[PDB]
Design an enzyme around this catalytic site. Structure first.
Site, PDB file in Angstrom:
ATOM      1  N   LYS A  60       0.861  -1.218   0.000  1.00 19.21           N
ATOM      2  CA  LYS A  60       0.000   0.000   0.000  1.00 19.21           C
ATOM      3  C   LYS A  60       0.880   1.244   0.000  1.00 19.21           C
ATOM      4  CE  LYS A  60      -3.788   2.326   2.412  1.00 19.21           C
ATOM      5  NZ  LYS A  60      -4.960   2.148   3.386  1.00 19.21           N
ATOM      6  N   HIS A  68       2.725   6.016  -2.324  1.00 19.77           N
ATOM      7  CA  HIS A  68       3.825   6.961  -2.147  1.00 19.77           C
ATOM      8  C   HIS A  68       5.045   6.812  -2.985  1.00 19.77           C
ATOM      9  CE1 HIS A  68       1.621   8.670   1.131  1.00 19.77           C
ATOM     10  NE2 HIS A  68       1.551   7.470   1.717  1.00 19.77           N
ATOM     11  N   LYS A  86      -8.621  11.775  -1.363  1.00 14.70           N
ATOM     12  CA  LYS A  86      -7.654  11.787  -0.236  1.00 14.70           C
ATOM     13  C   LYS A  86      -7.055  13.206  -0.198  1.00 14.70           C
ATOM     14  CE  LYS A  86      -3.616   9.701   1.781  1.00 14.70           C
ATOM     15  NZ  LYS A  86      -2.503   8.765   1.656  1.00 14.70           N
ATOM     16  N   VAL A  97      -4.380  14.878   1.194  1.00 10.82           N
ATOM     17  CA  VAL A  97      -2.930  15.194   1.124  1.00 10.82           C
ATOM     18  C   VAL A  97      -2.141  13.919   0.889  1.00 10.82           C
ATOM     19  CG1 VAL A  97      -1.064  16.023   2.491  1.00 10.82           C
ATOM     20  CG2 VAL A  97      -3.285  17.058   2.789  1.00 10.82           C
ATOM     21  N   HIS A 124       3.956   3.950   6.187  1.00 10.31           N
ATOM     22  CA  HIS A 124       3.152   5.215   6.273  1.00 10.31           C
ATOM     23  C   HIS A 124       4.055   6.378   6.000  1.00 10.31           C
ATOM     24  CE1 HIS A 124      -0.374   3.211   7.904  1.00 10.31           C
ATOM     25  NE2 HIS A 124       0.366   2.741   8.895  1.00 10.31           N
ATOM     26  N   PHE A 125       3.567   7.415   5.321  1.00 13.49           N
ATOM     27  CA  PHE A 125       4.337   8.638   5.104  1.00 13.49           C
ATOM     28  C   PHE A 125       3.872   9.665   6.181  1.00 13.49           C
ATOM     29  CE2 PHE A 125       7.026  10.799   2.092  1.00 13.49           C
ATOM     30  CZ  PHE A 125       6.809  12.101   2.499  1.00 13.49           C
ATOM     31  N   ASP A 126       4.793  10.090   7.033  1.00 11.68           N
ATOM     32  CA  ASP A 126       4.441  11.017   8.174  1.00 11.68           C
ATOM     33  C   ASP A 126       4.545  12.483   7.712  1.00 11.68           C
ATOM     34  OD1 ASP A 126       3.564  10.648  10.948  1.00 11.68           O
ATOM     35  OD2 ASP A 126       5.136  12.027  11.428  1.00 11.68           O
TER      36      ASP A 126
END
Length: 124
Positions: free
Chosen positions: A7, A12, A41, A43, A119-121
């Site tokens: 995912k 990303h 979505k 951002v 996950h992209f923070d």
């Protein structure tokens, strides 16, 4: 079905290009990566580096995540990225985005074995 790893790659990674080609990049990729299917979505950032380079960040500078978890990591190097953000006007099912291309450090949350981004923070 999707591993958090896979995912992340969908949401990303964009190793296909060195940078956003146009101000429509985000409109087009948010759609093509399935990030506008059911809602817009708001951002999302795409990273234009090799997958090995971005997975290696999970062994770089440990930092807290926005949510205060401690499995985030900031890249030592800047990376080519495109930041996508929904415009104020946008209403689903017609999702619209502003495209911004930059060279910044990324911060990702990492999980799994191999230990890889899930996950992209943030970018810095």
């Amino acid at each position: 079905k999707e591993t958090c790893a896979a995912k992340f790659e969908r949401q990303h990674m964009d190793s296909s290009t060195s940078a956003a080609s146009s101000s429509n990049y985000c409109n087009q990729m948010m759609k093509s990566r399935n990030l506008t299917k059911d809602r817009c979505k708001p951002v999302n950032t795409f990273v234009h580096e090799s997958l090995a380079d971005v997975q290696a960040v999970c062994s770089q500078k440990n930092v807290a995540c926005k949510n205060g978890q401690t499995n985030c990591y900031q890249s030592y190097s800047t990376m080519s990225i495109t930041e996508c953000r929904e415009t104020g006007s946008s209403k689903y099912p017609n999702c619209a985005y502003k495209t911004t291309q930059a060279n910044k450090h990324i911060i990702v949350a990492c999980e799994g074995n191999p230990y890889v981004p899930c996950h992209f923070d943030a970018s810095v």
